[PDB]
């Protein structure tokens, strides 16, 4: 044993599973708005010898020695992160050590707030994320609502947009210390200027969680939250198309009276919350951040917006309802209730024909078992060089699946009868098998980033 | 742009940096007890298309669809995790989603305890970890000391061992809800049975943090904490020689009928309470390493780790060095440099300049954290490069030369900053370091190195 | 020394001060809505040998022995408390050990809530009490907002009433565990039925803090909060006209599923929060509770309502504005801004002519230094057998003081110039001295409960 | 109805109950160390028109008006409070508004500490008070253990004294922000200087809860805790012989320039944080009692309290009784009945049936709280009735008879419930108790009694 044997030689069982997942990604239409396909260059840095280095601390302030190369990689990732978003190093710093997006948010809360301090974020069924302080009527679900006190702001159910007026009213009474401007399922742009006004009035910090839109912000195809936010967190996957990791952007310099974010943010990441950094992920992120500075990436992000708009119009022209009427970013929210179907049924039918989407709560749903919506995303297929006409062909495949689900629904009662009818009824299976073959044959023809077999 | 270009072609600046780190790992004597060299097979799974899949939830209970392959990989990693430690699936479950060791411990605290509940762990200067509840006299350092109430237990400075008597005394007064059995700088075995007795008396859960010794436990070369602990956390790197990730083991079944209620709370704390999407590429890399830990090869490796640590301990004693607790029973050695006339901060800097990486360590008794009087040395990393006993005796020879160079510089300098600058400024000293570095690097480059050839 | 010497013989310095305070109470017009004059019978029980008994625990469950007489007194106080409010002993219990009203509320929070649990109460400038969870924008002021998380509900600024709609909206988002229905400066009745609906929807307990109106509730001259509340707290002074102490009423029996308030409420009072009971206060309360069961007390409470209505109409007929337009209880809220004066100036002028009231925040005040209102109360002077015509004569004296303050205001700049002008200007002093003599000569003619000289 | 009717005329049921309690206090031997008999002068101020005045705030800084007389009374009570304990107004301030001793301690915690801050006090079975942070193994009892984090320190069972060594050991690990020096069942003096040394080392505030001994401190018959403590709380009843209320003393001025920041935080915690309107009738009654504590009469009383406690201690030792810590230095005596063959719960019930009120007390070593092995006896109450040494020797004679009656009943009964019923059922036993009660009540009625004549 030398430790230099290949995976295919030493673990055939695992190598086979890697190839099955690689084939599943190539043969299907990936429409989940949070997925993307990472480049081979970043994956090569992710599976590197940088996994073997413990570098607790920060560049120039390490606990162990022998960090001369790791220091340059982390400093390079910091520079490339500031360059990717056109930030002045005198006004902004960045922490590149968060393991993921959720650790990045919890580090910001730990740095700036005492336990049980108050935060406000968009409610989960309204498009927010779990780490924005989600708790039910019975249980504290997210740790952000356990160690801190959260109260959500909601959507205007008539416009499908954030109710900035009700947010301002409740913020005066709740007196939050930090407000989160960021979404996971929201097809419109956030009025960061209005969020800044609410934060300035109640004297709260403005955290921008741009995880879903970070790539579009880097390519300057949508307004940047850095103009108004005190803290900016993001994932490095999603629309940034990198390895799974997290980033924290914080203001530094003079506030009015200097800013005090830097020492607190860094101390919260380490030694408060995390252990040894994952230098292999940090390097893979630095690879992806460099790609985000090229004209290629701006062209890709522009195509993401165009492909999402094309998918929205193609759905409208076939008589589908869209939450908020349309889209201004990378995703679309489809209300299937006017068509007589729900998201739980559509998600299962589309999955059986190699089309991956996720059900989504719509403004008006009182049942979480069968949400009335569906969330569709452009960034993944756009990375396979999909164009507007390609996404209209995707809408054609989706409509076939929806129509099949409508006929299965009229022949079944509850959701369990619906799911089994798709597998048992040999007439529906043959119809699903034919649609799947046309989907997979169409999807396989496009290129795929990364390695060839895994 | 296809995303299929190589790193060397598309990002030469990063490709050069990866190669310099690979050269640094090959040419140096890595003696930090926390490190190991991961196999190429695990690294290939780490940098794969599994990075592209969101699979929030657990096998069979996923938020999104298209997780049929990911469900198999996570279930396979769970099966291999129980096999590697010889656990009965009817009595033990495992969660393979923690991002690292620190998230694994934090997930256990949030699962079992309310905010401000009481925790006891070994004090940090005594050999505990940050995530075991470290506070200073002026500030709460670890988040485990912010969201929860911690009180440390200490070593007996006479013997260098954990004072189990004083632990039982203070646990009766403090009444902790959870006691942590686990260390980062400790050369002896933990009396898990005595820890169990104390936990049973005060009705506390026993958490075993075996991150440093998990590889030795898998090879069954030291007693297993699974015989006494309620919860077992570990890193997947360190002595398990895998990719960086974490694991949580928990009992299930009948407790006394009276059942164990760990499974649902542990899994819920990881997701959706604390973490987001799992890192399936890391999970697969862990599954590869766990398979390797079941082979006879890994048992010979862990046995060699113990032999190499004992040989390094004996060779240090032959040269008039003193060891905390007088020796070692595991993978590391704690050296007390105070009788020799040097400190840990000075020796650490001298050894680093000759490509010998170690870390200074606090000794039982002192309190100066700027100039600790000790040094921590580990065997797992070099043993993975097929070092043997005679090779580690050779390593002590180089260390002995470095300590003597540091002793000469100490008598010519006053402060620590003057000591560090003298190693770079003095031309005679820099020449003695350069020749020692060349002999060290020539010695280290001859041994094999796991992973890829150039990155 | 035997310990049987009188106060006048052993401490002449203290006996003189007791007589000065007794004279000050007889010669002035006491209009503070929270004051009253306790009967001699209750004061005789208050200064009794019951001060000498430690009786930690509850009747039949004491820590020490020799509590046979104290057990009967506490049990008698419990019975008389239930009889004073017409409560079924099978549906209600009472704890008579709280030292005051504020300890009674904190005991309820400690019994029913974990630390940092959420409560809602009427905001302090809107008429609520400090113990209802008051915190400013800079500091947590009340301990109820330190150990627990409070968010206030407010008044509708246009009607001067509680905004029950905004309360229902914010309660759904804040998710409180306990809502407080009770006021310290509010001239209208509380819609306890609507409060019960809001509590039933968000699954919160309804606490009624009837300290100001407890006497009126016992005499059945206003609706009782016991029909809708889960917990009822009150002071024993104020309109109950007893010694200073507190009471906690709690539901017992079957809820739907038995109630679990009794064991938790009692345990919170002792041994959690308080030490040895004050048996001298408990007996003085039992004396006052017996008086509240007589037709005399119902006649007194009816006169309190009539005297407050008479003071309101007399103020209206002289061109004064009243918050919420009038009154339905024992107090009136006077808005002095339409008359060109504030509460800080009126309070000082009235105090100089032996008329005691307190300034009060009005709906619309942005300055707490000079509140625009004044709180006037009927229960104190009604205990001296004041009638409707007597209170109209009180309004005559107040109007003279207000008119004097208006002339001093036009001759001064800030509040400090106003206060000194009343003492320095020998023309204003002579005018204040003449009004004071007419006030004191009028007030001295009425009887006074309690002892004759102290 | 004028409100000027007497209690005997308007409420005969309550007037009869007051007279029965007055007769019970006159005819019994009150030996509960917590009690005293308040003078008539203080009781007259307690039941006065000061009950009618709302004066939220502090002198000069009141919410309402018409407080010119109330301001003088509160300021006079503050002046007399500093005079009674010989304090310099430049170095010490006092707050006279706490409703009782427990609110006084809670106000200090909320003033100086954040929620969940750490507190150390003497454990309840060891002689501490509930408000010092008492928890059980199953529940948080005191609110000081709910809003704050408490860990007890214990007695040395060998000597019955506070283990100052173990306190210093555990305080270094626990790191409390405040340490409480004060007891409810402790017969020896507290080494406040040693407590100060421990607080200085861990940077904690020293709170002296002198509620039981405040009268002895005012008369300067025992060392004063004001020489070492940062904050001093006390009840105004107990040995101060006043009405039931509380006091908070705090240092002011220069700490090391570095000033003391206690005054504004202490006053703010009392109002508006915790309490509402002050009880001015109680404040005036306290002011009367504080004036009495400055006279030579009160010094002779406190000296007689010490002599009477020593005489009761010597008389108990003459009759083969054992005392916790071997004696007493203050106002109370702790008797260990375990060598005598009885327990505290049985003796307490027998003594109560013959008009001798005491309370059972936990002894150092045992854990049965249902049947404690000890008894707490106090001298202040009977000393206020002009008892002398020979009178307390007579009191021990009655106690000795009761303990022997309880011993005979113990050999005829099995359980505690059978023991209690046998004292009422057995005709021979009830007759022996009735004759002992008549001799006790005849002895007690002959002594004077402070307060009013009939209520
Ligand atoms: Cl997402
Ligand atoms: Cl480590
Ligand atoms: Cl009030
Ligand atoms: Cl006591």
Please, could you describe this protein's structure?
Chains A, C: It catalyses: (6R)-5,10-methylene-5,6,7,8-tetrahydrofolate + glycine + H2O = (6S)-5,6,7,8-tetrahydrofolate + L-serine. Chains A, C: The modification Phosphoserine is found at residue 420. Four copies of one chain form a homotetramer. Chain A is α/β, with parallel strands linked by helices and 454 residues long. Chain A has two domains: 49-291, Aspartate Aminotransferase, domain 2 (3-Layer(aba) Sandwich); 295-444, Alpha-Beta Complex (Aspartate Aminotransferase, domain 1), CATH 3.90.1150.10. Chain A contains 16 helices and 15 strands. In chain A, the strands form four sheets. A seven-stranded mixed β-sheet of chain A has the order 4-10-9-8-7-5-6, with helices on both faces. In chain A, strands 11-12-15-14 form a four-stranded antiparallel β-sheet. A two-stranded parallel ribbon of chain A has the order 1-13. The first copy, chain A, is globular. Chain A starts with 6 loop residues before the first helix and ends in a 10-residue tail after the last helix. Chains in contact: A-B, A-C, B-D, C-D. Chains A and B meet through helix 1, helix 2, helix 3, helix 4 and helix 5 of A and helix 1, helix 2, helix 3, helix 4 and helix 5 of B. One chloride ion is lined by residues 34, 184 of chain B.
